[PDB]
Amino acid sequence: HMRNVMLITGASRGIGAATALLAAERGYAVVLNYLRNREAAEALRQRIERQGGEALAVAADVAEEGDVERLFASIDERFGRLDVLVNNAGMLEAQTRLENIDAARLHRVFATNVTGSFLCAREAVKRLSTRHGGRGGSIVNVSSMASRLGSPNEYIDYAAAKGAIDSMTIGLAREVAAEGIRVNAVRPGLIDTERLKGGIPLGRGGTAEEVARAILWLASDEASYSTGTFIDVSGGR
Amino acid sequence: HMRNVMLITGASRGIGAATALLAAERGYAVVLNYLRNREAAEALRQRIERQGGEALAVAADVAEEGDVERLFASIDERFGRLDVLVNNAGMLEAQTRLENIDAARLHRVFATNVTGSFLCAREAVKRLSTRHGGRGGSIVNVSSMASRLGSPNEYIDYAAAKGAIDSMTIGLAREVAAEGIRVNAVRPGLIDTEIHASGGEPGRIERLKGGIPLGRGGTAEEVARAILWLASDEASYSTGTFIDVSGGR
């Protein structure tokens, strides 16, 4: 009778929104965290509700520790529990070479992509861990094939942020395995939203729904013996 | 009269000091960048100068853009050229689980380990690149086996920082290969000089030494030799690669 509760950061559009809708379709109560696009997040909440589900939309900048504390407090108040965190909030800036990346850009890119994922994972561990009275659960980080390919001539800063996420995925998986938390990641490639497709063996961009399906599998009981692992959703890139 | 010029960040002790000393012994002019340990950096500069070498010591915080720009301006005026950057400046905080890592710690750990390496790499590209009147050169990032192992129950924030370095190594290698700049990394494991004992934790320290196939910690000199090889002409077809200096860990 009791729905499991999933928090999706950056849930208003793209992979985050597709993951929210897929999770609700599969029975989860969903927390849609957004930063700016309140309209899009509220419409997704209304949609999930119309179809008989439970959804909570919460504005919060995951780069800010106080915002993260309030985001999770809002989940505590509405549902009294948490089961899955999807660290999807990401930030991509303009195409650039590294010699033109300044400190302000590095601060912004690491704050949202990396610090945000750490701070949300931290609050999730405090709630999911059997050592804090939780019943376990899972965290799925949304990384990128950029961590492996390096995004040369585009955004090495973003590639580095996602390399940090991959290392955090491995380390956190090992650290909290014994308290009932699995930690995994998906690595999307080019998500469809001629030269670029040619570097994709399957010959097309991926869809947000394809990434969502991988995220949901890793959060599911089907993946009960997978932690510290990666599903690449990249068409062979 | 025209030595190749190597900038080493975090050069006052440990891996950075060993790398500066070895580079100077092999004929480089060296720039010893350091944060706060002036006595150690000055003693190193004097040692190199006594042996007939060329060394410039510069206090600068690589996390701070204004300091980085001044640091490279000082190289420009003293040597008028740059050939190798060793991104060694690193930062480790106390043992922790992730649930107790707060934003202020993450900011500090990424500022010194990641932002500093980006900002120095950026200034190095501006000088080494054949597109900007350089003759090429090398960047060697000092990463860690933590990037691969994750540092669970120790410092996942540091492991993440070093995973960021590994990805930057790959991406920058691909980006600036056509400008004459090779970019590689070393991944030290447990290095004797780099363990800062806090008192009362022999069990923790012993656990840290455990499960190393070669059965011992490494030396700063072992790391320096790998750095210098990657910066040398012997490595002329290697870019975007990694030498693990970890005893098999």
Evaluate the CA torsion angle A4, A5, A9, A14 in order and state its sign: positive
**What token pair was written down for A83?**
């089961």
What method was applied to determine this entry? X-ray
B165 CB neighbours in chain A (<8 A) are: 160, 163
DSSP 3-state assignment of A72? helix
Report whether A60 contacts A12 (CB < 8 A).
no
> What residues make up the domain containing A56?
1-237
Is A191 annotated as a binding-site member?
yes
Among B105, B110, B112, B167, the strongest candidate for a mutation testing the A interface, having the largest count of A CBs within 10 A, is B167
Give the three-state DSSP class for A26. coil
Report angle CA A55, A58, A59 to the nearest 5 degrees: 150
Contacts of A168 in chain B (CB under 8 A): 98, 150, 156, 159-160, 163
B171:A121 CB<8 A: no
Residue B151 annotated as part of some ligand binding site: no
- B-facing residues of A in 1-60 (CB < 8 A) are none
Report the Cα B243 to chain-centroid distance in Å.
13
- Measured CA to CA in angstroms, residue A199 lies from A108, A234, A236 at distances of 29, 10, 9
3-state secondary structure of A152: coil
DSSP secondary structure code for residue A3 in this structure = P
Total domains in the fold of chain B? 1
CA atoms of B222 and B216, how far apart (whole Å): 13
Interface of A with B in 200-229 (CB under 8 A): 228
Distance of CA B235 to the CA centre of its chain: 18
* Start-to-end CA span in chain B (Å): 42
Q: Please check whether residue B227 is in contact with residue B86, taking contact to mean a CB–CB distance below 8 angstroms.
A: yes
The secondary structure of A125-140 as a DSSP string is HHHH-GGGT---EEEE
Q: For residue A91, what are its two tokens?
A: 């930030």
CA B224 – CA A223 distance, rounded (Å): 43
**Who's near B50: CB < 8 A, 6+ residues apart?**
none
Please answer yes or no on whether A164 and B168 come within 8 Å at the CB atom.
no
User: What chain A residue is nearest to B120 in terms of C-alpha separation?
Assistant: A99
Q: SS in 3 state form for chain B?
A: CCCCEEEECCCCCHHHHHHHHHHHHCCCEEEEEECCCHHHHHHHHHHHHHCCCCEEEEECCCCCHHHHHHHHHHHHHHHCCCCEEEECCCCCCCCCCHHHCCHHHHHHHHHHHHHHHHHHHHHHHHHHCHHHCCCCEEEEEECCCHHHHCCCCCCHHHHHHHHHHHHHHHHHHHHHHHHCEEEEEEEECCEHHHCCCCCCCHHHHHHHCCCCCCCCCECHHHHHHHHHHHHCHHHCCCCCCEEEECCCC
Beta bridge partners of A32: A8, A57
Pairing of strands A55-59, B29-34: unpaired
Q: Of B28, B34, B155, B158, which is the active-site residue?
A: B158
Closest CA to A98 of B85, B80, B81, B174: B174
Backbone angles phi, psi at B55, to 5 degrees: -140, 135
Chain A / chain B CB contacts < 8 angstroms: 168
Scanning B59-78 for CB atoms below 8 A from A yields 64-65
Query: Nearest CA to CA, how far is B152 from chain A (Å)?
Result: 5
Residue located via tokens 């959060």: A219
The residue behind tokens 């599998």 is: A217
In the set A28, A34, A155, A158, the catalytic residue is A158
Nearest Cα to Cα of residue B168 among B242, B81, B230: B242
Element (H, E) at A31: strand A29-34
Residue with tokens 């030290």, as numbered in its chain: B188
Q: A-chain residues within 8 Å CB-CB of B96?
A: none
Q: Do β-strands B29-34 and B55-59 pair in parallel, antiparallel, or remain unpaired?
A: parallel
Question: A158 catalytic, yes or no?
Answer: yes
- Set of chain A residues whose Cβ sits within 8 Å of the Cβ of B122: 98-101
CB B220 within 8 A of CB B18: yes
Q: Which residue has the tokens 């991959």?
A: A166
